[PDB]
Write an enzyme that holds these catalytic residues in place. Structure first.
Site, PDB file in Angstrom:
ATOM      1  N   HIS A   1     -28.479 -83.192 -63.174  1.00  0.00           N
ATOM      2  CA  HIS A   1     -27.803 -83.378 -64.725  1.00  0.00           C
ATOM      3  C   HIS A   1     -27.528 -82.500 -65.623  1.00  0.00           C
ATOM      4  O   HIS A   1     -27.963 -81.069 -65.435  1.00  0.00           O
ATOM      5  CB  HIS A   1     -29.209 -84.310 -64.756  1.00  0.00           C
ATOM      6  CG  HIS A   1     -30.654 -83.432 -65.602  1.00  0.00           C
ATOM      7  ND1 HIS A   1     -31.329 -83.418 -64.351  1.00  0.00           N
ATOM      8  CD2 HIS A   1     -31.010 -83.271 -66.607  1.00  0.00           C
ATOM      9  CE1 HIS A   1     -32.211 -82.392 -65.199  1.00  0.00           C
ATOM     10  NE2 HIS A   1     -31.793 -82.273 -66.194  1.00  0.00           N
TER      11      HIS A   1
ATOM     12  N   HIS B   1     -22.204 -75.686 -68.774  1.00  0.00           N
ATOM     13  CA  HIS B   1     -22.731 -75.495 -67.715  1.00  0.00           C
ATOM     14  C   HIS B   1     -23.686 -76.133 -66.514  1.00  0.00           C
ATOM     15  O   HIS B   1     -25.024 -76.291 -66.770  1.00  0.00           O
ATOM     16  CB  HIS B   1     -22.537 -74.164 -67.326  1.00  0.00           C
ATOM     17  CG  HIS B   1     -23.599 -73.625 -68.093  1.00  0.00           C
ATOM     18  ND1 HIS B   1     -23.184 -72.782 -68.978  1.00  0.00           N
ATOM     19  CD2 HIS B   1     -25.186 -73.547 -67.876  1.00  0.00           C
ATOM     20  CE1 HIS B   1     -25.061 -72.328 -69.580  1.00  0.00           C
ATOM     21  NE2 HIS B   1     -26.098 -72.858 -69.323  1.00  0.00           N
TER      22      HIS B   1
END
Length: 190
Positions: free
Chosen positions: A125, A40
């Site tokens: 990221h 996630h």
């Protein structure tokens, strides 16, 4: 109580990242990849929090997520640190995520009052894994170039998911704290 809000990554993505990992493998290089349901995208990191504050964060989200819309971004490109020549931490990069950028900053800016750190520059990221030790060098680069453009997929950030992380002698623990689902429950029957 390492709370942190992330964005659900439909199979399209989840499976995507996996496809790349499978090709990589830890044959020569030692890389401890992360769980599949743990890829996630970290929207805003909170960290330690009190059972009393846990509610505060929610309120902010209910508002922010209500003041913003659902844009359609894409996940592609992967970066390494501190640098290619010497890869120690593998992390993926998201495409034009402006919407997700201005939001991450807005969510924090407010948290600053509740007693949180302010993140001037936000970067979307997703750490895939850390490198412990490797023997084959070429492989590293040879891949970095292949998975450098390898498209993973795209999606729209509508609902938000808040998960918690707690490391323990027995192992890493993960529990949900807040989940804002726009669409009514029981959407699709598995």
């Amino acid at each position: 109580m390492r709370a942190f809000i992330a964005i659900d990554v439909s199979e399209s993505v989840r499976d995507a990242l996996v496809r790349a990992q499978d090709y990589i493998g830890s044959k020569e290089a030692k890389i401890k990849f992360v769980e599949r349901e743990n890829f996630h995208i970290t929207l805003k990191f909170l960290g330690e929090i009190t059972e009393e504050q846990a509610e505060e964060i929610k309120k902010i989200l209910e508002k922010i997520a209500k003041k913003y819309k659902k844009h359609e971004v894409n996940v592609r490109g992967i970066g390494v640190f501190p640098n290619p020549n010497y890869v120690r931490v593998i992390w993926a990069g998201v495409e034009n995520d402006e919407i997700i950028k201005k939001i991450a900053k807005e969510i924090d800016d407010e948290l600053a009052k509740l007693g949180f750190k302010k993140e001037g520059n936000f970067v979307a990221h997703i750490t895939l894994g850390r490198v412990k030790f490797v023997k084959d060098k070429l492989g590293l680069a040879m891949k970095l170039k292949e998975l450098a453009n390898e498209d993973f997929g795209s999606f729209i950030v509508e609902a938000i998911e808040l998960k918690k992380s707690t490391l323990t002698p027995k192992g890493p623990i993960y529990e949900t704290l807040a989940r804002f689902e726009l669409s009514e429950h029981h959407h699709h029957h598995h």
